Amino acid sequence: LVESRCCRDLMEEKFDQVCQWVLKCSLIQMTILNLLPRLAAFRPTQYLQDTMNHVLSCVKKEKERTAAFQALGLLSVAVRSEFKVYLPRVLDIIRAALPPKVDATVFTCISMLARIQQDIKELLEPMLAVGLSPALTAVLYDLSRQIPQLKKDIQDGLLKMLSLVLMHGSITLALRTLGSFEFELTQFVRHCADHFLNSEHKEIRMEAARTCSRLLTPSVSQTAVQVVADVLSKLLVVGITDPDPDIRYCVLASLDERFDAHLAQAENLQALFVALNDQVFEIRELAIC
Amino acid sequence: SNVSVLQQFASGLKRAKAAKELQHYVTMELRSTRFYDQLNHHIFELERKGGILAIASLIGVEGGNATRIGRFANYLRNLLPSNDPVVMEMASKAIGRLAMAGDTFTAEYVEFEVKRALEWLEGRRHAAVLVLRELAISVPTFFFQQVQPFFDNIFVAVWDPKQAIREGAVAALRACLILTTQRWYRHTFEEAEKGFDDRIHGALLILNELVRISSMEGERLREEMEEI
Numbered sequence: 016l017v018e019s020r021c022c023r024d025l026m027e028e029k030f031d032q033v034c035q036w037v038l039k040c041s042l043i044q045m046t047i048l049n050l051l052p053r054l055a056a057f058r059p060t061q062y063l064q065d066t067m068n069h070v071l072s073c074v075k076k077e078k079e080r081t082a083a084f085q086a087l088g089l090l091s092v093a094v095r096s097e098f099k100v101y102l103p104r105v106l107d108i109i110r111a112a113l114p115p116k117v118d119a120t121v122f123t124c125i126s127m128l129a130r131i132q133q134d135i136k137e138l139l140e141p142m143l144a145v146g147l148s149p150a151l152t153a154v155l156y157d158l159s160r161q162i163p164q165l166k167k168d169i170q171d172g173l174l175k176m177l178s179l180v181l182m183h184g185s186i187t188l189a190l191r192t193l194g195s196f197e198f199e200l201t202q203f204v205r206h207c208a209d210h211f212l213n214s215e216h217k218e219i220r221m222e223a224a225r226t227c228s229r230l231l232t233p234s235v236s237q238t239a240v241q242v243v244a245d246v247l248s249k250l251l252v253v254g255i256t257d258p259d260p261d262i263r264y265c266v267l268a269s270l271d272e273r274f275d276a277h278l279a280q281a282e283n284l285q286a287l288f289v290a291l292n293d294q295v296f297e298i299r300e301l302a303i304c
Numbered sequence: 305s306n307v308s309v310l311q312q313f314a315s316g317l318k319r320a321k322a323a324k325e326l327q328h329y330v331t332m333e334l335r336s337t338r339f340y341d342q343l344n345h346h347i348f349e350l351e352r353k354g355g356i357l358a359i360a361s362l363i364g365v366e367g368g369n370a371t372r373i374g375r376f377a378n379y380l381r382n383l384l385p386s387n388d389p390v391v392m393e394m395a396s397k398a399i400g401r402l403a404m405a406g407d408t409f410t411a412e413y414v415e416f417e418v419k420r421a422l423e424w425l426e427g428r429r430h431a432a433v434l435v436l437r438e439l440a441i442s443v444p445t446f447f448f449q450q451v452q453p454f455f456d457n458i459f460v461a462v463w464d465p466k467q468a469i470r471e472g473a474v475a476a477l478r479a480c481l482i483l484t485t486q487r488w489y490r491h492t493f494e495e496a497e498k499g500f501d502d503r504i505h506g507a508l509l510i511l512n513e514l515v516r517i518s519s520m521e522g523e524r525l526r527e528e529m530e531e532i
Contacts, residue, residue, distance in 0.1 A: 046508035053515035
C-alpha cells in the first residue's frame with residue numbers, strides 16, 4: 016500500500032547511506048546490516064552486489080561479523096541465484112575460522128544459508144571441530160531433515176564425535192544428541208549404564224535416565240532380549256534408591272505404557288511394588304498408574 | 305508466619321531472589337496481609353529489585369481485585385518519575401502484569417499512565433517508551449485509546465540526541481504499529497523521510513520496523529534462526 020509505493024525511494028536512500036557511511040558510523044553499522052536483510056527480501060543485480068560487498072566488508076570488521084552473518088543468510092534465502100556464486104566467500108571465511116577454534120553466529124549463518132549438495136561434504140569437518148553446542152546440533156539436524164543429501168555422512172560425523180566424547184557437563188550434550196533424533200547400537204547402551212552409576216552429578220543423571228528409555232528402541236532372537244532386560248534393571252533400581260526425587264520422577268516417567276510387555280517380569284515387578292510406598296506423592300501417583 | 309516472610313524478603317532484596325519469590329508465591333497461594341504489605345513497602349522504599357519482584361510474585365497469586373490495584377498504582381508511579389537502573393525494568397513489567405489482571409480500575413489506570421507517559425515523551429523519554437510498550441503488551445486494547453498523540457510524541461522523542469532511547473522508541477512504535485496492523489501509515493512514512501533528509505541509527509530503526517511490518521516473509525526466517 017503506502018510502504019509498497021515508496022519502497023524504491025527508501026531502498027535508494029538506504030543504499031546511499033550504507034555506501035557513504037561505510038567507516039564513519041557502531042550504531043549505524045548495526046542498523047545498516049539489519050536494514051539490508053529487510054530491503055533485500057522486500058526489494059530483490061547492482062543492489063545485491065553492493066549489499067554483499069558491504070556485508071563482506073563488515074564480516075571481517077569487529078562487532079559486525081555476527082550482524083553480517085545473519086544479513087548474508089537472509090539475502091541468500093531471498094534469491095538463490097544472487098548467492099549462488101557468492102556463497103563460497105562465506106564458506107572460505109568460515110573454512111579457517113572453525114579450524115582456528117564468536118562461533119554461535121557462524122553456525123547461524125550456515126543454517127540460514129542452507130535453506131549445492133557438494134559444499135556440505137567437506138564443510139562438516141570444520142563444523143565438527145568447532146565445538147559441541149546445541150546451536151551446532153540444531154543446525155545440523157535441520158540440514159539433515161530439510162536436505163538429507165548425505166544422511167550417513169552427517170550420521171557418521173555425529174556418531175564419531177559422540178563415541179569419542181563418551182570415551183573419557185559437556186558430555187551431557189552429547190548424550191542428548193543421541194537421544195534427540197533418530198540415529199543408525201548395543202555398544203552404546205551397555206556403556207550408557209555406567210554414567211549414572213559412577214558420576215555424582217545430579218544434572219548428568221537427569222539426562223542419563225531420559226536417554227536410556229529412548230535409546231532402547233529395538234524392543235525373537237535370544238541376543239538382544241538379554242541386554243534390554245539388563246539395562247532395564249539399572250533404571251528401576253535407580254528410580255527408587257536415588258536421594259532426590261527429581262531423578263526418580265523422570266525415571267518412571269520414561270517407563271511409559273510402551274514397556275507393558277517388558278515390565279511384567281517378576282524381578283522387575285518387585286522394583287515397582289516398592290515405589291507405591293513412597294514419601295512423595297508425585298512418584299506414588301505415577302507408580303499406581 | 306511474618307518473621308520468615310520478612311527474612312526471606314530481605315534476603316532476596318540483598319538466583320536467591322528468584323527462589324525466594326517463587327517460594328513466597330507458593331506459600332501465599334497455599335495459605336498476615338498487613339505484615340506482607342509492610343514488608344513490601346519497606347522493600348520498595350529502600351532492594352529495588354527485591355521489592356518489585358516480591359510485588360510481582362504476589363500479583364496474580366493472592367487475588368487482589370481492586371484493593372491491591374490501588375496500592376500498586378501509587379507505587380508504580382513512584383518509580384516512573386525516575387528511570388532507575390535495569391532492575392527498574394522489572395517494576396514496569398510488574399506494573400504491566402498487574403494492569404493485565406483484568407480489574408475494573410485497570411482501564412482507568414492504563415489511561416492515566418498513557419497520559420502521563422505522553423507528557424514525558426534521557427531519564428524520561430526512555431522510561432516512557434518502556435512503560436508504553438509494557439502497557440501495549442499487557443493491554444493492547446487500552447493502548448489504542450490515544451494513538452494519534454502517541455505517534456506525534458514518538459516522532460519528537462526519537463529525534464533527541466540519545467542512543468538507547470531510540471531503541472525503546474522503535475520497540476514502542478513497532479508495538480503500536482503491530483496493534484494497528486492487527487486490526488497512520490502516511491504519517492510514519494512522511495516523518496521518517498523528513499528526518500532522513502546521531503540521525504543514523506534512529507532513521508534506520510524506524511525504516512526497519514516499517515519494512516518488517518509491510519513484509520513478514522523475512523521475519524519468519526529471523527524467528528526460525530533465533531529459535532535454532
